[PDB]
Amino acid sequence: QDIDLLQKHGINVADIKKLKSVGICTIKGIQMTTRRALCNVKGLSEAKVDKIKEAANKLIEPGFLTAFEYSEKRKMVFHITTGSQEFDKLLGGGIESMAITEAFGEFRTGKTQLSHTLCVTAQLPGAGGYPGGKIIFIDTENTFRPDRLRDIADRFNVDHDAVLDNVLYARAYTSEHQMELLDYVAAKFHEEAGIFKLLIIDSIMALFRVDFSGRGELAERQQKLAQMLSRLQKISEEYNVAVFVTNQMTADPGAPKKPIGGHILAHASTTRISLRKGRGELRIAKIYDSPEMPENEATFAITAGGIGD
Amino acid sequence: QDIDLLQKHGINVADIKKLKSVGICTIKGIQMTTRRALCNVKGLSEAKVDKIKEAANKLIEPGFLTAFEYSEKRKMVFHITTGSQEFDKLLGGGIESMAITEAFGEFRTGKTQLSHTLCVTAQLPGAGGYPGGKIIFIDTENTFRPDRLRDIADRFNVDHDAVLDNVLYARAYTSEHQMELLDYVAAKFHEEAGIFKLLIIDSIMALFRVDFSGRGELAERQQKLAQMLSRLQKISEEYNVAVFVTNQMTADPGAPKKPIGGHILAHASTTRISLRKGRGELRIAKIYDSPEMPENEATFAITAGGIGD
Amino acid sequence: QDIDLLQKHGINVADIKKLKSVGICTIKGIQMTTRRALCNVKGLSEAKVDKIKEAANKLIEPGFLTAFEYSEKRKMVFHITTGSQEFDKLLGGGIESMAITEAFGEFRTGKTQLSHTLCVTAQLPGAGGYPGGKIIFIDTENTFRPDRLRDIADRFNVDHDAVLDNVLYARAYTSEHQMELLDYVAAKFHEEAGIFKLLIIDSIMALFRVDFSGRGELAERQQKLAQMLSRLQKISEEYNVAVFVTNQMTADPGAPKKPIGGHILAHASTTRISLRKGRGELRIAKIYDSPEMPENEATFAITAGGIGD
DNA sequence: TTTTTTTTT
DNA sequence: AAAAAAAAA
Ligand SMILES: Nc1ncnc2c1ncn2[C@@H]1O[C@H](COP(=O)(O)OP(=O)(O)NP(=O)(O)O)[C@@H](O)[C@H]1O
Ligand SMILES: Nc1ncnc2c1ncn2[C@@H]1O[C@H](COP(=O)(O)OP(=O)(O)NP(=O)(O)O)[C@@H](O)[C@H]1O
Ligand SMILES: Nc1ncnc2c1ncn2[C@@H]1O[C@H](COP(=O)(O)OP(=O)(O)NP(=O)(O)O)[C@@H](O)[C@H]1O
Ligand SMILES: [Ca+2]
Ligand SMILES: [Ca+2]
Ligand SMILES: [Ca+2]
């Protein structure tokens, strides 16, 4: 899986450790970089980069899979449950495995309570043979109270010390620190192959809407957000992990609410779960922009223990 | 149809297998390449390429067809239906057969639901004697859930295993991998003559808007998109297949929405179908830039089963 | 903690006093500024700012803390009590230490009486080993009667002259004077390290709702309020101090009351305490938007001596 | 050719 | 039941 199949196929050793300096560590990682962004890396020409692409092209089929073959090749995908069976039948078993899942709400709709539940119920063996693994959590506002994890872990009856161990944690401080933090994500997914299951970014747009002005720096903002969302799509298919992201809302005095991000974020997201408030601690959850499931509604219970019924 | 009529017309055998190395496999394929791009191929001079163009020019008429002759010669064209009779009377029978058809929407307007329907209703014998054939699908975002094909195939009452067999599938990963994937398309159209009917690119501009910067690399981007769209126009007339492409949108703070691509994509496209959202699961479809049909509107129903009424 | 670790790591002396001119005085302060807002400062290029970010990156771990490590690293946080044990069991021990706490009421609900109590009960050694320290108070309406502090200090039996000494005071006059007053806050937190515990802004939105018009200058107002609230989040984690803010209310003729600020203020606030009036001098306090504590209610007594039972 | 922001009473 | 303004690559 890692880059040593090219040594027996016409590539010497003096560039394998030079390609590993930028972040490329997988054979499919060479399939995902352009030939123009392999020259501006630190010390390679145009004459010797052509013989790397023909070296990698013999290892994977450059052909056309039949749709019957892709049906079995779409059995890598797991479905990570939420904590309530009314929210998983809505989503269709849980969260997808090679995709980006969005969720947005007003202000008290339970976004990080949905995030804090997933830090517990992804370490548990669910349906379909999903084994469970460790969890990357990139917090961005402040909200990673870890004693709330010890409050949800008791209703699933798991040990306290062995549920606070599989959650790796790192806080971003600005918009570019959120982008340079994805390099250590791709390394930790790669050096320990097969024991990571999801990646949670607590809010993508909580730092872009503050580090940029209004109409002046709008075009640089969406051209920097698109470079980040495409990198997350490649990470979620390199190592087959789920991605769950949340974002906030804004008003509309031109005509009520709508999520921020624009058309860049709405297109690059696979599923979007709207969230609003009901009576007491019930919450209503709709479905926006799903490839498979239709638009229905469900109900929550944000109790001590995350999401319930 | 293939290149062996030149052997009896002054061309030896030592270049026929040398022209087949680049991709030229048809007599009309020599009519579509320049005399300047036949020298930079791998091993031919200027003195021996002149005697190939005079060898091919005696086989097809270098004259002027009367418009009465071209009327019968425009009876190769079929029309592939959508799934609703309100959307085919708008388009004028369905999708054109020697052309490029575009469709763009906001984010939930049902673009890949329109694409997933065409993977089923092109294997069915429709009106005008259209027999039905296999389907090339080039996905670019992630969205080729094949179990949705088993959900539309039941409302047309066809067998499940014989509808998952005629869909060949390949995913592009970068912008140049999307261009080098068209070589295997032209070979698979050629080696099995007459059993392919359409080609679907899921999004052209979902990879160009991310692999290029703003005003810096704008001119290289549109000069690489124009090389791809012209290649698709030649493929759609070599083997007489339909081309259906989709693309996304952007805002306009200078003055609402407009499709990306610029003037290169709007000129090289034959028909453009705008798509917006109505109440519930109704959608409204307009017509932009059609050579034949006027500007009208229709209505959809994106149910389990693709497009309905 | 201050910026002298870079002198032994490839940074000369000619920019350390030039970075101190804008406000950057801590090693983590370089972790919180962008690379784009380090060029427009007064005299630095793009070629010499790259070697500052690599100089600071070796000092702190650019890695991933385990959640067991972050549990001990969340023991910096203290909890500043209010004055009644019914309001601290509701909040969960008191006010948070790395967060922004909001409180809103109708007009007589006791917002500045809640603020005037905190100027006294933060100089007292409470539970959990909280030592007590000095207090920054940014008043914005007019309401900092200091003889009310001598009325609450007697029920805690502390000396009068040594409770009027630890309260530094400054009044803002317009919206931008409220923003330029935070520069002297960050300097006074830095030059006397470890003897400041909270920062009180008396009202954020008492000056934004008057210096701006209706729908005309709405977008500039929320784009200037978001620049201020993010700066307060960084201050509250640079030096580990609490932030307590209050704001007012408005009606709703479209359909009763709701707090001003919009979705910018509701998202950037960590905890919100609603306040209403009961019979006599009892007041009722609810909880809006808390990461840890559920929605319950309590009771007050605004007597001579601040908040009681 | 590119790119959406923001509730008041 | 009514009210709009914002630009740089
Ligand atoms: N232990 C708990 N038991 C019950 N409800 C709780 C508990 N902790 C928090 N809540 C509720 O959960 C809600 C807060 O959810 P939260 O995860 O903060 O959503 P949020 O949208 O991220 N808030 P914000 O990030 O500011 O927009 C509030 O209604 C709290 O009252
Ligand atoms: N089985 C189904 N029944 C009914 N509606 C469905 C079904 N599956 C998906 N939908 C709806 O179809 C819409 C999604 O259409 P889609 O094909 O994703 O358009 P799209 O523009 O390609 N989305 P995107 O590519 O991100 O822009 C959503 O409104 C879904 O709720
Ligand atoms: N010495 C005192 N003893 C008891 N109650 C007092 C005393 N001084 C003031 N109050 C009460 O405190 C209340 C005013 O508290 P205050 O914190 O000023 O509310 P407020 O919300 O700030 N008013 P405003 O700023 O205009 O919204 C009134 O009900 C007064 O009667
Ligand atoms: Ca939150
Ligand atoms: Ca799609
Ligand atoms: Ca007051």
Numbering used by the authors:
A (entry chain B), B (entry chain A), C (entry chain C): 22 to 276, 284 to 337
Task: Give the article text.
During HR, a recombinase binds to single-stranded DNA (ssDNA) and forms a right-handed helical nucleoprotein filament, known as a presynaptic filament, which then searches double-stranded DNA (dsDNA) for homology.
As the binding is not sequence-specific and as there could only be one mismatch in 15 basepairs (Oligo 3/5 with an A–C mismatch in Supplementary Table 2) for obtaining a stable mismatch structure, the densities of basepairs are averaged out in both homologous and mismatched structures. The RMSD values of mismatched DNA are substantially larger than those of homologous DNA for RAD51, but only slightly different for DMC1 and RAD51-VpDg, supporting that DMC1 can stabilize mismatched basepairs. The results taken together support that DMC1 can tolerate mismatched dsDNA by stabilizing not only the basepairs (by providing space for misalignment) but also the DNA backbone, as proposed in the structural model.
